[PDB]
Amino acid sequence: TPLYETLNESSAVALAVKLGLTCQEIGDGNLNYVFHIYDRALIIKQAVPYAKVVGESWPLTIDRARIESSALIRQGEHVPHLVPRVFYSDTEMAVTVMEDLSHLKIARKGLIEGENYPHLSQHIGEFLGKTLFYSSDYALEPKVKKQLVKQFTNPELCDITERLVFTDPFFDHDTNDFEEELRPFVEKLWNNDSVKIEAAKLKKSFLTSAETLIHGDLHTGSIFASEHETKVIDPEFAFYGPIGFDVGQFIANLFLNALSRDGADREPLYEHVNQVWETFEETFSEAWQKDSLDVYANIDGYLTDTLSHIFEEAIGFAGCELIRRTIGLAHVADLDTIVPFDKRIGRKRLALETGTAFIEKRSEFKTITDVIELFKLLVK
Amino acid sequence: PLYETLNESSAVALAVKLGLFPSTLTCQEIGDGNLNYVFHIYDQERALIIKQAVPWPLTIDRARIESSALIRQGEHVPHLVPRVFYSDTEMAVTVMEDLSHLKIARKGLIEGENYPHLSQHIGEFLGKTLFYSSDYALEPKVKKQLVKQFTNPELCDITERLVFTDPFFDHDTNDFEEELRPFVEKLWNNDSVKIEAAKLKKSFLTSAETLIHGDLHTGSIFASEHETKVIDPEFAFYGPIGFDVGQFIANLFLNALSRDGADREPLYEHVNQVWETFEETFSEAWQKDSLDVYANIDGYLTDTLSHIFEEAIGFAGCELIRRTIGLAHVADLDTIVPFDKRIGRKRLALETGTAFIEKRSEFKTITDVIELFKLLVK
Numbered sequence A: 001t002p003l004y005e006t007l008n009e010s011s012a013v014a015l016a017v018k019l020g021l022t023c024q025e026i027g028d029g030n031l032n033y034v035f036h037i038y039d040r041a042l043i044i045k046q047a048v049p050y051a052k053v054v055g056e057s058w059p060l061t062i063d064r065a066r067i068e069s070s071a072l073i074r075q076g077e078h079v080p081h082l083v084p085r086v087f088y089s090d091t092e093m094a095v096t097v098m099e100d101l102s103h104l105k106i107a108r109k110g111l112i113e114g115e116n117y118p119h120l121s122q123h124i125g126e127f128l129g130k131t132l133f134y135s136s137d138y139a140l141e142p143k144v145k146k147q148l149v150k151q152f153t154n155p156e157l158c159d160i161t162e163r164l165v166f167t168d169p170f171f172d173h174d175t176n177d178f179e180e181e182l183r184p185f186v187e188k189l190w191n192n193d194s195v196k197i198e199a200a201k202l203k204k205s206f207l208t209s210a211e212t213l214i215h216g217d218l219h220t221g222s223i224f225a226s227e228h229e230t231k232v233i234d235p236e237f238a239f240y241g242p243i244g245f246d247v248g249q250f251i252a253n254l255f256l257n258a259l260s261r262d263g264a265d266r267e268p269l270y271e272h273v274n275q276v277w278e279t280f281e282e283t284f285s286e287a288w289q290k291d292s293l294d295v296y297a298n299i300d301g302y303l304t305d306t307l308s309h310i311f312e313e314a315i316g317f318a319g320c321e322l323i324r325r326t327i328g329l330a331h332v333a334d335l336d337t338i339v340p341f342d343k344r345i346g347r348k349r350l351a352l353e354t355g356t357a358f359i360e361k362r363s364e365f366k367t368i369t370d371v372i373e374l375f376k377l378l379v380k
Numbered sequence B: 001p002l003y004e005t006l007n008e009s010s011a012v013a014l015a016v017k018l019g020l021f022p023s024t025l026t027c028q029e030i031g032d033g034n035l036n037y038v039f040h041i042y043d044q045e046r047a048l049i050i051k052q053a054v055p056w057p058l059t060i061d062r063a064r065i066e067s068s069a070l071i072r073q074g075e076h077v078p079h080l081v082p083r084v085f086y087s088d089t090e091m092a093v094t095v096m097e098d099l100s101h102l103k104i105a106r107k108g109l110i111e112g113e114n115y116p117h118l119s120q121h122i123g124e125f126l127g128k129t130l131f132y133s134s135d136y137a138l139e140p141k142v143k144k145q146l147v148k149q150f151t152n153p154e155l156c157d158i159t160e161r162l163v164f165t166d167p168f169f170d171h172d173t174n175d176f177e178e179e180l181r182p183f184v185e186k187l188w189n190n191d192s193v194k195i196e197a198a199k200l201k202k203s204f205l206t207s208a209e210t211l212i213h214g215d216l217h218t219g220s221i222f223a224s225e226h227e228t229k230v231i232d233p234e235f236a237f238y239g240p241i242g243f244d245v246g247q248f249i250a251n252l253f254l255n256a257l258s259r260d261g262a263d264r265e266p267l268y269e270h271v272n273q274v275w276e277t278f279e280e281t282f283s284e285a286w287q288k289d290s291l292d293v294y295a296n297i298d299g300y301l302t303d304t305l306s307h308i309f310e311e312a313i314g315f316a317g318c319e320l321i322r323r324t325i326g327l328a329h330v331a332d333l334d335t336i337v338p339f340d341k342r343i344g345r346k347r348l349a350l351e352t353g354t355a356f357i358e359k360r361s362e363f364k365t366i367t368d369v370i371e372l373f374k375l376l377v378k
């Protein structure tokens, strides 16, 4: 007999009980319940099947919970201070029991509120360098890594990213969602064949480049923050993909916040972009020196060319994220809450244009500061 | 445990239990290596092959990859692979079409056979097999499952070490004449070539593009004047599209190095033709049968073919070097006489392989590859 039962606030306290109080459901979306239990505190997250499930949704099994639990556990073996601790998980119940982080704030929300989070990029850069290194062929015996590829195959969730990030914003597809005022600019994109060919190439990398175990959806809404703490949450999109992907998505979301700000307010976000590349690069390099298994690791120029490839892919993926968050199905609050309406349109236009240029020019940039300086000029 | 090692009577008992004959037959073990049995079974008033893996240490799971890979290949190019009548994982057995009327390509090629259709046939094999198991042809969710199904860790381990790693360092698996050492050490001390061998290996390790054959040499092919059959896909897994292309082209070049003068021309025609045909076939499949919205944007197919080509050339360079000084050699080079000419031709294998790896992205056409090779081997 099937063990899956949808939890309530009472059921959740019963479960925490049987794994040796007050409870409130505090979830943000409609695809998961998140139960906060207080005595010492705890979070119990449970996936909600299609099916139902209140309100329109993308149809998904509850297998995503197995990916998220196991992804979070793997991340905590390398960066235990940058992810919530997991106390229990169960794939049939689709349950992850984890550390309570409600004394922190979702990074996106704080950034929109004008919080600057001075260590956000230091922490995310460390998260990125260590997670992305330690699950690759550089760090792992290839036989071990090939099994981890099987274990983290993520078809349904990859299908979402393949469509939404890499495909739908580039044609007149039904999932797109944009203001009519934006159409002339959106059609410029659709008729641009050379950027579309490059989008195809970045997609093919996404589809085929099993380089490391990625988070797969590292935006500012998937991170908890305060002045001194950062915690990366919700790796439900985890699978073996290109190292540059998580880096690009994060960097794109820093730039998306910068577009929603004005003038000298933007400067903290530009420092965060510069710092997250800088830190990602030292962290990845330190891990490579100290912990690489291949005979080729210490040949002068090999780490350098590896970093150049990651950088190029990361900028291309960033451009995809910039564009897709502006005109695709899933938007960001940074842009959608800009006031007045005409200013919102103008900044949405600039997201499309800087995304396009990121994609096109990815392999011409030599440093992160090149990326920032191109951005600033395009958004003057 | 079910597995039992077959003998000649045991094999005939198997064939009859599958109803593939009928009832009087004869059987002889005819296997080349010592890691598999191959039983030929014949009927007066029809014939059959039963291949069985026997437990460099390797599990018998390779037999499940071989069967499955052979079956997948026959869905697209049934005329270019042996038919499979039965397979079983526990017994590690593939029952297949008898191809004893044909000759192993490498052996014919060394004897001086020219096989005029070999490259046309391999080109079609390569274009179709490599297209039709990729994301271009398959729903991504379907492809992701096939990646699991063909994960092949042990055999990929052999390739990772032998083609991509050991020839480039003073490693214990290497095996070469002492007279060749100065040239071998030129390679070990060459950083920029090794950095590039590293990149090609990283592609091998990470680039899950299609279901490849993974060991497409001239000894994995049966030939005659009119027929070609690709055998033994035991190394099959999801890897870079250019790999099987490089390994085959390198193996044509290796035979060229074992021939002299005008006798080399057939192999050069084969190299040009295998690329041409691989490219025409892959393109026709892409036009007719690609699933992505991006397939018909002008320049995309072209850029895709340019990347395949570049990788294929780099993988060819690796194969040339690896077969000359690593553990597993080729008879083309090892049987060249006199000893001194053999060493000189093995030197040219190392140097043409090195150039292929380093220049892979500078060549514009297959003709540039052939012309560079001809020049270096003058």
Ligand SMILES: Nc1ncnc2c1ncn2[C@@H]1O[C@H](COP(=O)(O)OP(=O)(O)CP(=O)(O)O)[C@@H](O)[C@H]1O
Pocket: A026, A027, A028, A029, A030, A031, A032, A033, A034, A043, A084, A098, A099, A100, A101, A102, A106, A221, A222, A233, A234
């Ligand atoms: N460990 C934790 N501690 C405290 N609150 C948490 C928490 N995990 C989740 N939450 C609360 O629940 C909200 C939703 O969390 P989460 O992003 O994991 O859910 P979700 O996966 O259903 C959303 P989506 O569909 O956007 O991916 C958070 O923004 C937060 O307020």
Ligand SMILES: Nc1ncnc2c1ncn2[C@@H]1O[C@H](COP(=O)(O)OP(=O)(O)CP(=O)(O)O)[C@@H](O)[C@H]1O
Pocket: B030, B031, B032, B033, B034, B035, B036, B037, B038, B049, B082, B096, B097, B098, B099, B100, B104, B231, B232
């Ligand atoms: N389908 C077939 N029809 C006729 N003979 C066949 C055959 N398959 C294999 N053989 C015979 O068996 C020999 C060895 O076969 P094969 O190359 O498949 O085995 P193998 O995998 O044991 C070799 P290796 O271990 O070197 O890769 C061939 O060279 C051929 O003479």
Ligand SMILES: CSC[C@H]1O[C@H](O)[C@H](O)[C@@H]1O
Pocket: A058, A160, A161, A164, A165, A217, A330
């Ligand atoms: C159907 S899910 C839409 C988006 O939400 C997730 O966070 C991913 O970013 C996905 O693209």
Ligand SMILES: CSC[C@H]1O[C@H](O)[C@H](O)[C@@H]1O
Pocket: B056, B158, B159, B162, B215, B328
């Ligand atoms: C240890 S096996 C050596 C070689 O034989 C196979 O045919 C492959 O080419 C492998 O590299």
Ligand SMILES: [Mg+2]
Pocket: A031, A032, A234, A236
């Ligand atoms: Mg979620």
Ligand SMILES: [Mg+2]
Pocket: B232, B234
């Ligand atoms: Mg074999």
